[PDB]
Amino acid sequence: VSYTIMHSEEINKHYFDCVIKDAEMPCFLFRDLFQPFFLVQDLVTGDSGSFLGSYVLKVVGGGRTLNTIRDYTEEEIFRYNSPLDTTNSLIWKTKVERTTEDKKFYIMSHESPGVEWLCLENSPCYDIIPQSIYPPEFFFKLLVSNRGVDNSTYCDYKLTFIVHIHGLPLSSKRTSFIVMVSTSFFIALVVFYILFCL
Amino acid sequence: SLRILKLISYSRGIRTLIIAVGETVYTVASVLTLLFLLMFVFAILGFCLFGVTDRGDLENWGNLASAFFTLFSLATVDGWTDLQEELDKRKFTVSRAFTILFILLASFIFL
Amino acid sequence: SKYDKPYADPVHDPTWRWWQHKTKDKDYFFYLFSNRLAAEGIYINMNAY
Amino acid sequence: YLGQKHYELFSTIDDIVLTILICEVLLGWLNGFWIFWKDGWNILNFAIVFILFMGFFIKQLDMVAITYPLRVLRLVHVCMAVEPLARIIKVILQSMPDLANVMALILFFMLVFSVFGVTLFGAFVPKHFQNMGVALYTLFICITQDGWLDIYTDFQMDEREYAMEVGGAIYFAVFITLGAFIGLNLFVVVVTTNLEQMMK
Amino acid sequence: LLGLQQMILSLTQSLGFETFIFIVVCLNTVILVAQTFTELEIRGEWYFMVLDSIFLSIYVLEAVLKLIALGLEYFYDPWNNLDFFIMVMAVLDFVLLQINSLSYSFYNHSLFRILKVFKSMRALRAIRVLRRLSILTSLHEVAGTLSGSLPSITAILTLMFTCLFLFSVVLRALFQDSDPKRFQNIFTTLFTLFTMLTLDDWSLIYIDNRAQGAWYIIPILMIYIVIQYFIFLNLVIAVLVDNFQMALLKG
Amino acid sequence: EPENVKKMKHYLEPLLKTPVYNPLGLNLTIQGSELFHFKVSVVPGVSF
Structure with missing residues (x-):
């Protein structure tokens, strides 16, 4: 968490949390580029070293608020993470060349450029209207694995956690709808003004 | 060079030019005195603002001669950027406003 | 059984994390205890737990 | 090193100059409070002596930064009285009403071109283009036009060939040169107008 | 209709x-x-x-x-x-x-x-x-007296444009294989000539060109700087001063 | 006074009826023309 905060500060020259600050929970910015770091700690020892290698990341669920998240099926994760899916369901896309076996999911390391978040039209980013003030916030539950990208571990450190995001601008129609309804209502009012002024 | 000045003491045309520009001596002396008064005012002001606290910014608003030279530079256009970068780190946010006010009075009025 | 949370945290030390603000009152509670005035003569220290 | 044998003499001369100033103010008051209150410079002198006397007799955080500049302001006021600086001083104050409109126009153009400025500002090439007050004052620095190649190297290397390093730089450069020329010309123009007034 | x-x-x-x-x-x-x-x-x-x-x-x-x-x-x-x-x-x-x-x-x-x-x-x-509404007549008259002498200032800016383009051409020509890295193309060239015209680290240009093997390019830059400075700034100052001076001579 | 002797000072200054200071930062300022005779003591109960 702290390495993520200071790396975002160094790269983006800023890092904005939520309006309600949380000590354990940091609110990552959608505009800020995300570069994940992970570490293996051996809690029975006095050792905790960073994960200097490759790891597999894939979003397995999304939620608007607390306990509003659900896990996603295998085909759902294939739609949302695999670049082979021609359907516009990808949540993120990283300009990297390394890919796992069967070319299913991208493989990224500690030297990777970063994570660029998209969450296209099939993602739940589209058709989002928060019920109150401030930009809507979202949580993404996801797992990081080392199942088939390890040459030095006898088992994978499959860790499931949650990533926060805020500031979600993903859609289109709504803008067109409000634009045409404003134009129609205002031209109706102006035409009424003209006719009643005559 | 004083001997060369004695050489150029000739040339009656330059003498007529000197006569024609010689009535502005009192005026330029008055403008110089107003300039010096403004340097003294902002010299005591810059000293009181940055050198009495004695937490840095020495030999810029500290000693009298160095302070005077820095004020003359700030009244000119030269050195203002590096002087501002020197003064903004001394936990004095309104020093930037004071210095830009000093520029927009002194430089414009004098020139 | 509780430190299985999925976040990294600072240096792990759950006793230190729950101590937190009370780590700066060691000699404070020691003086309150030594004169036999604080509570029922009960003293709880750092390294015991 | 001089102060350690001069501080008591400094206090005595402070008391002497304060009491002669308030004596002069009382002598001016003797002719009438209405005429002294309805004056252009006696108001300034009365304010000076009032601030100095209140900071002297009553406890105040005014300290050296008020005691000394007020003394040199009184010095300027007294040296204005002798003739061969009063004409020059009189027309500096005559030039400021005609200068104020130039300042207003300059700041209005500065804002309406900073709207163009703040579009290419903020969250990129930061620490002098962000905060929307530091950006304004940095554009003011670049308009005052000395040593802005630190800023040039700051927004340098966007793509190393053209990027917006061509567009934004030429936009702000032509704006800077036009604004600087117009401002300097307007300043010397207001000066020449008001002095033509003083020789008329 | x-x-x-x-x-x-x-x-x-x-x-x-x-x-x-x-x-x-x-x-x-x-x-x-x-x-x-x-x-x-x-x-x-x-x-x-x-x-x-x-x-x-x-x-x-x-x-x-x-x-x-x-x-x-x-x-x-x-x-x-x-x-x-x-x-x-x-x-x-x-x-x-x-x-x-x-x-x-x-x-x-x-x-x-x-x-x-x-x-x-x-x-x-x-x-x-x-x-x-309320553009204010004082600054309205000020702006009109600004815009009174348009042909003179346009002619002067045309002249300064021609002179900068000539200086850019001659300096880019004389600086060939003399570390062009600051001004390798036309845009960065004309920007360096803008800095030279706006008194910005051309003394630094002199000190880091003395480190190079060329010395006579410094008097050329020198005379070009001083002539374009004095001529252009004096022309614009004089033109605008006189333009407001007939307005002062009128009502 | 850091956030280390706040509870000490707030507990002690009532029942000792005297201001309580923190060491390693103590400085004095005197406005007088005479002999000043100062004594420094340590609060009771923290030593034998």
């Missing part, structure tokens, strides 16, 4: 342009100055662009009304030509955002930079149409 429509449009255009346009443009200016404002956009970013699209719809309604209006004399106004140009880019970027899909780069790209500067002259035109 010909000339009768035109005269109805004239009268109702006067009325509704005085009433409706002023208040909606004032609100557009309020939201735009609250928008630019790079500290409150994170206290926003969702209530901001919707209002942008709404007021851009209002602006394209203004464009539709002006198009259905009398036409040619409306086009004869240069400010109205600027308005038509701004509405053209507004509908262009609006439909570009509306179609989505596409095949080019996005997520705060150079085209997006072009779009927000497009919104910048949109805000400028809003500011310009909000000052129909």
